[PDB]
Ligand binder design. Sequence first.
Ligand SMILES: Nc1ncnc2c1ncn2[C@@H]1O[C@H](COP(=O)(O)OP(=O)(O)OC[C@H]2O[C@@H](O)[C@H](O)[C@@H]2O)[C@@H](O)[C@H]1O
Ligand SMILES: CC(C)CCC[C@@H](C)[C@H]1CC[C@H]2[C@@H]3CC=C4C[C@@H](O)CC[C@]4(C)[C@H]3CC[C@]12C
Ligand SMILES: CC(C)CCC[C@@H](C)[C@H]1CC[C@H]2[C@@H]3CC=C4C[C@@H](O)CC[C@]4(C)[C@H]3CC[C@]12C
Ligand SMILES: CC(C)CCC[C@@H](C)[C@H]1CC[C@H]2[C@@H]3CC=C4C[C@@H](O)CC[C@]4(C)[C@H]3CC[C@]12C
Ligand SMILES: CC(C)CCC[C@@H](C)[C@H]1CC[C@H]2[C@@H]3CC=C4C[C@@H](O)CC[C@]4(C)[C@H]3CC[C@]12C
Ligand SMILES: CC(C)CCC[C@@H](C)[C@H]1CC[C@H]2[C@@H]3CC=C4C[C@@H](O)CC[C@]4(C)[C@H]3CC[C@]12C
Ligand SMILES: CC(C)CCC[C@@H](C)[C@H]1CC[C@H]2[C@@H]3CC=C4C[C@@H](O)CC[C@]4(C)[C@H]3CC[C@]12C
Ligand SMILES: [Mg+2]
Lengths: 48, 324, 96, 48, 163, 96, 48, 145, 145
Amino acid sequence: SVTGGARNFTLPPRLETAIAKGLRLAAQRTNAWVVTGGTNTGVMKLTG
Amino acid sequence: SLQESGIDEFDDCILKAIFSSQGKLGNKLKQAMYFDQLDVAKRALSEASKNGQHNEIAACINDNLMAAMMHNKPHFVELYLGFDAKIYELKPSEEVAKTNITALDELPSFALAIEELYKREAKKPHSHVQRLVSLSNTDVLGRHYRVRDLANTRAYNVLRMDQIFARLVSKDFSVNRDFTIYDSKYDKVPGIQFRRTAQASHMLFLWAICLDRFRMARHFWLIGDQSIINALVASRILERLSTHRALQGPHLAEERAKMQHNAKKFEELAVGVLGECHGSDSHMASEMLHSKNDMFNKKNAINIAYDAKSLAFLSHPATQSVIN
Amino acid sequence: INALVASRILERLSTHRALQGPHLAEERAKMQHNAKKFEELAVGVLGECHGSDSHMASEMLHSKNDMFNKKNAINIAYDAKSLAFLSHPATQSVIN
Amino acid sequence: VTIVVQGGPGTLGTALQAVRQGTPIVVVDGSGLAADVLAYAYNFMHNP
Amino acid sequence: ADWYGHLKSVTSFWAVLFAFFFPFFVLPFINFSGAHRLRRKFAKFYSAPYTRFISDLLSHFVLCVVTSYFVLDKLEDTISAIEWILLVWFVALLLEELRQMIFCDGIAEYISDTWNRLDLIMITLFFVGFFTHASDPSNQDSKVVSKGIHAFLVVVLWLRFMR
Amino acid sequence: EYKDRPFLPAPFILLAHVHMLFMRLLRLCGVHTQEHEKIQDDETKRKITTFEALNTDKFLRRWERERQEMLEARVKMTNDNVVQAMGMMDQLLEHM
Amino acid sequence: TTFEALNTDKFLRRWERERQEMLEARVKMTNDNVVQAMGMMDQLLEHM
Amino acid sequence: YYALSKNLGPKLIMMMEMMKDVSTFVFLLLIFLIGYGVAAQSLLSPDEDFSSRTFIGVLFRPYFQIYGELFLDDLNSEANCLGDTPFTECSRETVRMVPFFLAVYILGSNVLLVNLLIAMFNDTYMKVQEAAEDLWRKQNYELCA
Amino acid sequence: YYALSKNLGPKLIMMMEMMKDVSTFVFLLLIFLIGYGVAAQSLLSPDEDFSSRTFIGVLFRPYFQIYGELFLDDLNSEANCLGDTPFTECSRETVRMVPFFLAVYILGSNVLLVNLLIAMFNDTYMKVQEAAEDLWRKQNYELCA
Ligand SMILES: Nc1ncnc2c1ncn2[C@@H]1O[C@H](COP(=O)(O)OP(=O)(O)OC[C@H]2O[C@@H](O)[C@H](O)[C@@H]2O)[C@@H](O)[C@H]1O
Ligand SMILES: CC(C)CCC[C@@H](C)[C@H]1CC[C@H]2[C@@H]3CC=C4C[C@@H](O)CC[C@]4(C)[C@H]3CC[C@]12C
Ligand SMILES: CC(C)CCC[C@@H](C)[C@H]1CC[C@H]2[C@@H]3CC=C4C[C@@H](O)CC[C@]4(C)[C@H]3CC[C@]12C
Ligand SMILES: CC(C)CCC[C@@H](C)[C@H]1CC[C@H]2[C@@H]3CC=C4C[C@@H](O)CC[C@]4(C)[C@H]3CC[C@]12C
Ligand SMILES: CC(C)CCC[C@@H](C)[C@H]1CC[C@H]2[C@@H]3CC=C4C[C@@H](O)CC[C@]4(C)[C@H]3CC[C@]12C
Ligand SMILES: CC(C)CCC[C@@H](C)[C@H]1CC[C@H]2[C@@H]3CC=C4C[C@@H](O)CC[C@]4(C)[C@H]3CC[C@]12C
Ligand SMILES: CC(C)CCC[C@@H](C)[C@H]1CC[C@H]2[C@@H]3CC=C4C[C@@H](O)CC[C@]4(C)[C@H]3CC[C@]12C
Ligand SMILES: [Mg+2]
């Protein structure tokens, strides 16, 4: 399950690619069922 | 902490949050096998063995061996042995259909897991297993020159691959199996919990001599008995896998050179056990090299090594003491 | 003298007449390896004798031995058949 | 496993119903808004 | 996979040579990787480049054996039919070398190979030797000078046969 | 070389040239029957470039792990970590 | 068979001792024990 | 019966794996032989009918000219060139290239392909001689069996 | 008296340890010699009684045909075959295999066993030449003694 701020998401790109690389290797190695919020703003857009 | 820790500590903190939850120990060891943290899962099983729980471990580790054989982790199948692993009680993922055969109905439900591992091994593209079964030209029970839906869905059973390895050593192997041992009625005899893993480990050793996995074949060679004879059988099966007829192109050649390298490692292992037999009681080692084998048609191990074509086993001083 | 006697006894143990089969051959190669270690030790003590007082080392190599029938150590090394002791510069200084 | 990345009040509500229903959480410190609040609360309470 | 094509991997030298020499015995060999089945069988068998390589080998070996019997035997007072067959042959090799001239990546990419320089040498010396013999057929000395040019021809034919 | 050859041997390759000249006279000229061509998709080539970029990152992570598995970098990081351990040990003494 | 099993265990203990006597495993365990010594040294500073 | 001794026993297996490189040298040598044989038998005998004697003339002298026996007196008698110098005053001018092709042939064969066979026999003797004693102990077991 | 110099002194010990490989080449060569000698002396002279002249005929020409001297004019005079080509019009047809066996023999000996002796002499010169100066200093002591 990923939770976070929808419309107030503002991060640096290096930290965003670090969280995206860690979540990409975790979702690749885990084969997990990811539950986020359904909307297209912020970290649910990033996890999508 | 994101900027104050490494990039490879994030799988450790997700697996620490996985081990924070309690009650899901097979899926916790499955995500420990996916995240490849061996010492953390060793600390988890050591803390569970220290606390006194064993029944959740004995429920978990049979599916953990099955998933660790399916996903190719040798250090995990080295680790789960020694904690009452019980190799013969493995269960497959799916259920095998009825094929109306009396020999196939006597398989005690781990042979279908070996056939599921062979079907998962043959599902990769450009695999040598599927081309070797397609160039074998044999039946479902492994009889030569007898070439159906049964012969296609059950094309990778363990008795057919046993007949392929029995033709792959020589013309005089004649491998024997006894699947009527695996029953609840044969429990009062003492030593049979040796024998019910050991031949069973030999079957997984034949799956680990098919897929070029050295560490798992070394570990099932450690678990099973008759180590010199199975090492020379391993060198002969890898030396006939190194040519066969499908590994003849330029695109497989380093792969078949890898076959030669594994073959060399098992023949070094055969010399080393006989090196320990040259270390003490060499008259007993000379009685061992003169002893007849029931896995062949009553030939000793020097004739087995000559049918293996193994130069290092023939050049040992104990074998040359028997020859001299 | 005892190191060259050790190299000659291990060099005659390396053939003799009983160590002639194929089943002892690495064992007799082990004999050659030990023999080489003692002849290196003989060179090294003479290497210390080439380190200081080489005229005293030349008097040592000209000295007669009571453990043989009055022959010096270069004849003992020739009866040992030791190539490294004959190739030392102190022994070649006595020979030259 | 629930991962809190930055966040707001409803992210703290999903963290509250994650902890009150027994789901373990991962809070990434140094990321932003509510994750520094949750990391400051856990580092104040349990970190020695 | 571009070399074998639709032939999988298990073929010998003598298997594709016996299937080349007998097209009716190709069909029992199973199809590797009613009328359309057998036709697509000899279409995918004869569309492979390995069959084109064994066709050019065997055809250049039939050339070198036939020009060895041409050069070692005596020439006639008129033009023999084996010389007409070698003339029509080398015209077909001259149209093949002009076909490799236009369908290439360049003039220098064609001529940078040693074999294209050598095959031009043998086409040039065969036309010099045939025009030397056919300038005057009823003279012994023209047969002597033509067999002298044809000796260099059969030397560079055997030296092309190393390809 | 043998991808572009017309198959028919040397004596009969002139009949294949007459057939190639007939296809050059018919097709890519007047009264053409059919011309065949193939073009790759953009999403397939995007899958090729993202697969190439992911294999480039997997090769550079595997080559970084294999470059740290050499003996020279192991002796170098052992030397620098022992020097940093003496610096933290000097902080421990000064604290004692 | 019991003599063969005891010589198999004596060969694998002697081969494990000879595999730890190589230079590569010695440099590897020297590197990991120096990294574990820096971790225990960081625990000693934080304790100071 | 040479497999009892430790010297001659690997030399047999070395001689068989040298005979494979001999067959490789046969496949390299037959091109230069038959090419210089058809060219030299055409230049020595023009306007002559084909028989088995022409096939003896393309097999006999090329093969034996690479071992050192040059037949230049017999080639001078065969080409019917008269003089104190062996090729000046011949009847036909095309037989004066009969040494010249021969020059190229022995530069093809006597100094080139033979020294390639010394190089393959040096690599063949290295590939035998690093593993000779295992082959001798295997043949000692085959003598016992 | 060559043991004083540093060059020729190891070359003597190298020549003696090459003469052991010469005796190895004698034991490899005598099989092909005597086999081609009995076969060639049987094919050249049929219906002839055994004497010492037959033993000279099995020892003389096989030995000297491996050094380059091929006796094909003397074999053509011995087989009594008449012609411009040396073996076409013979009296008996079994003498036309007298080159052919010879072909196999020099492929047995002139290009095979001799190049095996270059390979053993290269390994013999390596086993001497890594330890030459100790043998020279030992022979300097034997000159002094
Ligand atoms: N899921 C949403 N999508 C879009 N807008 C939202 C959402 N949730 C809140 N908003 C509005 O957008 C503004 C931005 O708030 P943020 O702090 O960016 O998001 P947050 O309030 O933390 O919402 C948390 C929500 O997201 C999910 O991760 C989680 O399930 C939680 O419900 C807020 O004022 C809020 O009114
Ligand atoms: C580039 C090279 C290879 C060209 C090939 C050379 C050959 C084909 C040519 C070049 C010179 C020619 C020779 C020139 C002159 C004479 C003298 C004449 O009375 C008989 C023919 C003879 C002996 C010719 C034979 C053919 C010949 C040898
Ligand atoms: C590549 C090399 C080894 C070529 C092989 C040599 C063979 C093909 C040749 C070389 C010399 C030839 C022989 C030369 C002379 C004669 C005598 C004649 O009356 C019959 C043919 C016969 C007996 C020939 C047979 C074939 C022969 C042995
Ligand atoms: C690339 C290589 C092959 C070059 C070829 C060299 C050719 C062109 C040369 C080299 C030696 C030459 C021969 C040497 C001498 C004579 C004698 C003369 O009375 C007629 C020409 C003739 C017979 C020559 C013909 C041409 C010749 C064969
Ligand atoms: C393996 C090799 C070295 C074979 C050894 C060669 C020996 C056995 C042979 C080769 C040539 C032979 C000689 C050839 C010619 C003659 C002349 C004759 O009137 C008496 C015998 C005599 C003198 C022979 C003696 C034996 C001989 C020297
Ligand atoms: C498989 C191989 C080694 C078979 C051995 C071949 C030998 C034994 C045979 C095969 C062909 C035979 C030859 C065939 C024809 C003739 C012509 C005749 O007028 C005299 C005998 C002669 C010359 C024969 C001699 C023996 C011969 C050479
Ligand atoms: C395996 C190897 C030894 C094959 C042996 C080849 C044999 C069978 C061949 C090769 C050369 C042949 C000879 C070549 C030419 C002639 C001349 C002819 O008028 C009679 C047969 C005779 C004498 C042949 C007999 C058979 C022969 C010796
Ligand atoms: Mg071309």
